[PDB]
Ligand binder design. Structure first.
Ligand SMILES: CS(=O)(=O)NCCc1ccc(F)cc1
Ligand SMILES: CS(=O)(=O)NCCc1ccc(F)cc1
Lengths: 265, 265
């Protein structure tokens, strides 16, 4: 992978692997999410960030955390195919940062998917949200386009929709979900792609066998610890739409909420 | 990736990804196992296979893993290039063996090696059978005729008989269930999931202070999508040895058994 001519965005080509595909021999939505994560890490590596916290973020125990992740896929890359992903960042004033992705077929050059994520500042010890100071902004703005560049431009689009809380009783459920060591990242925290998988575990197998995931919007409220147990809840709201909710199996503490949209194969 | 000059082996280079590493910022033993699987699939793709030969498809026969043995000296770091070479060999009428050599792409030194024993089996009834002559001729033209062993040594650990773990186990991880990410393209549980499940009963203190040097896994039964697994471990031993056993949470039906060897960091 490499930064573009202007150094204000990064591109990388990936060859879809055998174990990265589902029953239809195309990459899963979790393989795609992992690829988005990898190109994002490589973009921060290429612009100076060590093994993406700035200088002011290190002195003050501050980290970027995901608050929302929205993905729209038109075509899932087949096993053995090359997918090209372009990623960039933009300041959202004092609220935080946004990271966008464009997925293209390396052969045809056509856009096959797009994603957007909203990140907020947070103390890594107390977990208190806070806001992007002023000294922090100057350190990362030199790597962002100043003019807006939105993967989801549309006025009144799916990525900025308010998601309600799933009302009990849920239509479907997957209980007793626990992260293993493969679900953890290098910092021993549950990887954000695991939550996508957990949300999709309560979708019935018949829906998965006859439909394809077109859109998925996930809101992150709290982190699931290594020793926490999760319940995954789904209710049809409708193409098929679903409302989702992940909560701790014990006290019922909310960790995630979202929506999915599926299309007949 | 590409076949060697003689067309009797295949090589492929991989760049270790961000989400593929553990707490030490080096690839996990499951990332390595997935890479071995990917280069094996690409080797079969490059030599004509659309795993199954013309006679195997006529008879509804498939290759299944009976044993997997991996020995790692160095785990590739995040961002590093690992080069893996793989080949196959006929084991008379017992079945086939697939071997792997892992090298550092910069230094050229061997950093790991693996060996697997595959047996012939009816896809439908699940009954094992010897390799017939007509099947042998179809795949022999892609194997070296002279032996080429990744583990040559006279009394080596890859051919050791593994005993059954006696109850009560020293350690345990109960209620393990595969999710959709744990399934392959044919909706069967991927063999790397069993490695992860075996390692779930190893205490976190052992994982934090030691590195996995050797792992030998014997496959007795396939775990279904709706099956629940219990993972059992007992210390058998500067170095630490463990005896492992995976069994169905209900009836206690054996699905896997193995051993691991760890070294102080
Ligand atoms: C939360 S993030 O969007 O992943 N990173 C914000 C800081 C950054 C800004 C521009 C970069 F080229 C790399 C990192
Ligand atoms: C993957 S295997 O079950 O270990 N071997 C099957 C036969 C084969 C032999 C040589 C090849 F180049 C590819 C496949």
């Amino acid at each position: 992978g490499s930064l573009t001519e202007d150094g204000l965005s990064y591109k990388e080509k990936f060859v879809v692997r055998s174990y990265e595909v589902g029953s239809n021999k195309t990459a899963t939505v979790e393989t795609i999410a992992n690829l988005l994560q990898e190109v994002g890490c490589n973009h921060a590596q290429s612009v100076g960030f060590s093994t993406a916290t700035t200088t002011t973020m290190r002195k003050l125990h501050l980290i970027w955390v995901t608050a929302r992740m929205h993905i729209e896929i038109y075509k899932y890359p087949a096993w053995g195919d090359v997918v090209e992903i372009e990623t960039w960042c933009q300041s959202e004033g004092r609220i935080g940062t946004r990271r966008d992705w464009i997925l293209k077929d390396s052969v045809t050059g056509e856009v096959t998917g797009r994603a957007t994520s909203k990140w907020v500042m947070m103390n890594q010890d107390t977990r208190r949200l806070q806001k992007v100071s002023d000294d922090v902004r100057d350190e990362y703005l030199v790597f962002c386009p100043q003019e807006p560049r939105l993967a989801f431009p549309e006025e009144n689009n799916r990525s900025l929709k308010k998601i309600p809380k799933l009302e009990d009783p849920a239509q479907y459920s997957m209980i007793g979900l626990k992260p293993r060591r493969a679900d953890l990242d290098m910092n021993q925290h549950v990887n954000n792609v695991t939550y996508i998988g957990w949300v999709l575990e309560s979708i019935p197998q018949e829906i998965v066998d006859t439909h394809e995931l077109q859109v998925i919007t996930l809101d992150y409220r709290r982190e699931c610890q290594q020793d926490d147990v999760v319940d995954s809840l789904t209710t049809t709201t409708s193409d098929s739409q679903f409302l989702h909710l992940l909560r701790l199996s014990g006290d019922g503490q909310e960790i995630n909420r979202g929506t999915t949209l599926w299309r007949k194969k």
